[PDB]
Amino acid sequence: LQKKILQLCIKVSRKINDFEYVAKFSSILITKYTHLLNQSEQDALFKEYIQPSITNESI
Amino acid sequence: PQYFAIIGKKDNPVYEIEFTNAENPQGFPQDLKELNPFILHASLDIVEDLQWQINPTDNCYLGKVDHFYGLAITAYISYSGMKFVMIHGNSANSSVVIDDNNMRSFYQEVHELYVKTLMNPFYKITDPIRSPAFDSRVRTLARKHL
Amino acid sequence: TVGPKQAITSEASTTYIPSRIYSESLLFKRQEASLSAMAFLFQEMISQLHRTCKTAGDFETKLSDYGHNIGIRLLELLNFRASSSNYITKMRRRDLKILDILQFIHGTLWSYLFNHVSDDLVKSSERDNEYMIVDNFPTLTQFIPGENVSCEYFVCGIIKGFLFNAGFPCGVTAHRMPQGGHSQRTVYLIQFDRQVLDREGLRF
Amino acid sequence: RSQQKSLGRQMKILGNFQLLAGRYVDALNSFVDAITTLYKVRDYLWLGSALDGISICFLLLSYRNSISIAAMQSPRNSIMSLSAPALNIDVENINLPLLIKCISDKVLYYYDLSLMHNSEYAPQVVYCEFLLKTLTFMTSCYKSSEFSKDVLDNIVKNQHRALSDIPNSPMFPRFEVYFYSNKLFELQLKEMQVEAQIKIYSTMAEVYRLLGYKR
């Protein structure tokens, strides 16, 4: 449930462009989880979503 | 197209499983993710404020309880803490069929499989069950009552 | 159905029956070992706990945790035998309030364990969060000279795990007081918290 | 039926006009320009009540099915506003109770009871709006929805009786059939307009957070 509800929060924060919140909640997604995230369930199609965090000054 | 859950006291699912009829041969494609915990999370809400009162003599079994706009849910409350939820229904029809007594002979019948696994003294509370045998038993125990 | 994995599985169009790799009866068997054997088991357990633990209160908690381990376990099939293989008629009523569930220790917990009944279940005078059960001649600690009352916190731990599943978190203590010609009777003056007392205090 | 249509349009426009133009804010009561209203400090929708009573009577005698629940909306708004807030114990709803006897949902004598009864009556009349197949409020005449007015109807219902279950528990309680009677969004609700969806989900979420049902 936390995986799905953080994926929805990250997609809102993309579409409404609050960049410290996509920074905050995607850093909290990567830290507190991802034993249940292999190269499927969009982790290979993720980290492209946070190179805009690191080309920003965000994280 | 049937979906079992055993959801604990601090919201953890100690056992959760789906299966499908081969007459459907799949289950709820594109609906299998909204009919998961959020509906069941609100089902925990309604059995949270439905258990502690006497009145909405069979205090454990409760039958069909609620209905989102595609299907409807059923429930069961044990005094072990646990709240059994089966989610059934073919996705095309609005499935009305609550058998209400023969699937009452599932909840008191899956209860002992939870009992003997709880009596494993290495098994704690608030941790899920990777029994390779008790999950193969329940689908065949659901082969009794589809 | 792992925590890491999803709830994913396969279709119902085969047969896994029986595949009991191990499933049996669970009925009330009777084998009735001697009090010397279980007394020696308890004896060397209390020897380990005076070995490994510092002072009074942490040893009291490190005794009552065993009761919290198996109190849940004895609760659910003691209720599944008393208020109900398993060609089941019904399962009867759950805990309505406090006064049926501390009747349920009084009715069929002691007679499940020690073949008798604790002699009173006194609702307290001055308050209502506190309740008190006295056993008259405690069975599993009758040999220990009970001037320290730290040795009967097996059973305070075992009833706290009979009420923590029941939704009443509860400070459970024991004292010992010789009110009768019955000597060395121990009072389990239990408490509760305010909140399920206030959940009782919504309507009573 | 032309007389029914003429009386329907005139009675609905006159009911809403004399409703909004009597006691709009009457705590200072600027009594100049007294053409369209009494507009004094004792002017609280009394002629609006008489006009709405005659309007609901002529609407029941018109016999509509779509616009006719707006007469019950007008009488329910009259017995809410001019018989709750600036009421001063007048509560002149005799022909409103006569229309409750005639059309639907009579036999109530309390605050938050007859309002719920007439809300059920207006909901049943809007359910009896089977197929109007026309345009009445002409903001949209080909791409419109009876869904888009019925969601406003029952959210008027939800905001005007969901608060009566107080969050001090024992003070003013009723049974928790608010969720039971709240599960009524069987309609599709797939984006007629996004701010209608936002206010409908804000209120639907806020009442669950009010009643302590978080999940």
UniProtKB/Swiss-Prot annotation, chain A:
Whole protein: which stretch is covered? 587 to 645 of 1289
- Its recorded name reads Trafficking protein particle complex II-specific subunit 120
Task: Outline what the protein does.
Answer: Specific subunit of the TRAPP II complex, a highly conserved vesicle tethering complex that functions in the late Golgi as a guanine nucleotide exchanger (GEF) for the Golgi YPT1 GTPase. TRS120 plays a role in the YPT GEF activity of TRAPP II in concert with the two other TRAPP II-specific subunits TRS65 and TRS130.
Instruction: Report the family membership.
Output: Belongs to the TRS120 family.
Q: Which residues form a coiled coil?
A: none
Question: Encoded by which gene?
Answer: TRS120
Q: Give the quaternary structure.
A: Part of the multisubunit TRAPP (transport protein particle) II complex composed of BET3, BET5, TRS20, TRS23, TRS31, TRS33, TRS65, TRS120 and TRS130. Interacts directly with TRS65.
Other information: Present with 259 molecules/cell in log phase SD medium.
Location(s) in or outside the cell: Golgi apparatus, cis-Golgi network
Swiss-Prot record, chain B:
Listed Pfam families: Sedlin_N
Gene3D superfamilies attached here?
A: 3.30.450.70
Is the keyword Translocase in the record?
no
Report keywords, A-Z: Autophagy, Endoplasmic reticulum, ER-Golgi transport, Golgi apparatus, Transport
The coiled-coil segments of this chain are none
| Domain of life (superkingdom) | Eukaryota
Describe its partners and assembly state.
Part of the multisubunit TRAPP (transport protein particle) I complex composed of BET3, BET5, TRS20, TRS23, TRS31 and TRS33. Part of the multisubunit TRAPP (transport protein particle) II complex composed of BET3, BET5, TRS20, TRS23, TRS31, TRS33, TRS65, TRS85, TRS120 and TRS130. Part of the multisubunit TRAPP (transport protein particle) III complex composed of BET3, BET5, TRS20, TRS23, TRS31, TRS33 and TRS85.
Instruction: Specify the protein name.
Output: Trafficking protein particle complex subunit 20
Source organism per UniProt:
Saccharomyces cerevisiae (strain ATCC 204508 / S288c) (Baker's yeast)
Encoding gene (name): TRS20
From Swiss-Prot, chain C:
Family to which this protein belongs: Belongs to the TRAPP small subunits family. BET3 subfamily.
Q: Major location, coarse class?
A: Golgi
List the Pfam families: TRAPP
Q: What taxonomic classification does the UniProt entry list for its organism?
A: Eukaryota, Fungi, Dikarya, Ascomycota, Saccharomycotina
Q: Which GO terms describe its biological process?
A: endoplasmic reticulum to Golgi vesicle-mediated transport; intra-Golgi vesicle-mediated transport; macroautophagy; retrograde transport, endosome to Golgi
Q: Which Gene3D superfamilies match?
A: Trafficking protein particle complex subunit 3 (3.30.1380.20)
**What more is known?**
Present with 8350 molecules/cell in log phase SD medium.
Task: Write out the annotated subcellular location.
Answer: Golgi apparatus, cis-Golgi network; Endoplasmic reticulum; Preautophagosomal structure
Keywords tagged on the record: Autophagy, Endoplasmic reticulum, ER-Golgi transport, Golgi apparatus, Transport
Species annotation:
Saccharomyces cerevisiae (strain ATCC 204508 / S288c)
Protein's UniProt name: Trafficking protein particle complex subunit 31
Q: What does this protein do?
A: Component of the TRAPP I, TRAPP II and TRAPP III complexes which act as guanine nucleotide exchange factors (GEF) for YPT1. TRAPP I plays a key role in the late stages of endoplasmic reticulum to Golgi traffic. TRAPP II plays a role in intra-Golgi transport. TRAPP III plays a role in autophagosome formation.
Q: How does it assemble?
A: Part of the multisubunit TRAPP (transport protein particle) I complex composed of BET3, BET5, TRS20, TRS23, TRS31 and TRS33. Part of the multisubunit TRAPP (transport protein particle) II complex composed of BET3, BET5, TRS20, TRS23, TRS31, TRS33, TRS65, TRS85, TRS120 and TRS130. Part of the multisubunit TRAPP (transport protein particle) III complex composed of BET3, BET5, TRS20, TRS23, TRS31, TRS33 and TRS85.
Would you tell me the Gene Ontology cellular component terms?
A: cytosol; endoplasmic reticulum; phagophore assembly site; TRAPPI protein complex; TRAPPII protein complex; TRAPPIII protein complex
Q: Extract the CDD domains matched here.
A: TRAPPC5_Trs31 (cd14943)
